[PDB]
Amino acid sequence: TACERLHVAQETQMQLIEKSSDKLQDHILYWTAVRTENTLLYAARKKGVTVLGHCRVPHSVVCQERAKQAIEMQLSLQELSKTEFGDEPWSLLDTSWDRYMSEPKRCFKKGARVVEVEFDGNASNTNWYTVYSNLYMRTEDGWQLAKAGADGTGLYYCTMAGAGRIYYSRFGDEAARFSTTGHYSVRDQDRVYAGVS
Numbered sequence: 125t126a127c128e129r130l131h132v133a134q135e136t137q138m139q140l141i142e143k144s145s146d147k148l149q150d151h152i153l154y155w156t157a158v159r160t161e162n163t164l165l166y167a168a169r170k171k172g173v174t175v176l177g178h179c180r181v182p183h184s185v186v187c188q189e190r191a192k193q194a195i196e197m198q199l200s201l202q203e204l205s206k207t208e209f210g211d212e213p214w215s216l217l218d219t220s221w222d223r224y225m226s227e228p229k230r231c232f233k234k235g236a237r238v239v240e241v242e243f244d245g246n247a248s249n250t251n252w253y254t255v256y257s258n259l260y261m262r263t264e265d266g267w268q269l270a271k272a273g274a275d276g277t278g279l280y281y282c283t284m285a286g287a288g289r290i291y292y293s294r295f296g297d298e299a300a301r302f303s304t305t306g307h308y309s310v311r312d313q314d315r316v317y318a319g320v321s
Contacts, residue, residue, distance in 0.1 A: 126164055127177060133161035141216065148210050151219040152201045159194035162187045193221055200224075200262065204232065207267050209260055227279070228292040232260040239274050240311040241295055243303035251302060253293070255279055276310055276317030296321030
């Protein structure tokens with residue numbers, strides 16, 4: 125049974141990845157499959173199984189972490205499907221671990237654009253940051269929408285829990301990291317901001 129189920133997990137993944145679904149149901153299924161695969165492989169290592177089928181089994185610490193990662197993704201998305209946002213189009217990329225974990229950590233986000241920070245006046249010292257216009261956050265009152273954006277101070281987001289912008293990344297601090305003057309300017313699209321840490 126362990127092998128059969130393992131194949132089902134792996135087959136579900138490879139197949140879904142080729143689909144590129146809009147349905148959130150499918151992305152829950154994807155992570156369920158990853159969770160299954162890695163848990164089974166974890167259990168196999170803890171019995172001293174080094175090869176299953178004719179496939180080396182990854183070290184338990186690798187299986188465990190991927191299982192943990194898939195667990196969080198799965199339940200998070202299962203919680204999401206139960207809200208108003210669960211009806212929207214959701215992609216594999218919107219549903220990626222890398223998306224979830226990028227800035228700000230541990231929330232879902234879609235609607236991307238790039239922001240260009242230039243330091244010191246040097247065109248050569250230009251960084252690109254990704255703002256996501258929509259953020260989907262787990263809070264004590266459950267999941268709810270937040271809207272992010274950029275300004276001369278940093279990248280921020282706006283929830284209706286407080287009349288204010290909550291910055292998660294500050295350009296002045298980036299200017300400290302990467303610049304030699306403190307001076308930076310911030311191109312959005314048709315907007316340039318300028319600041320000094």
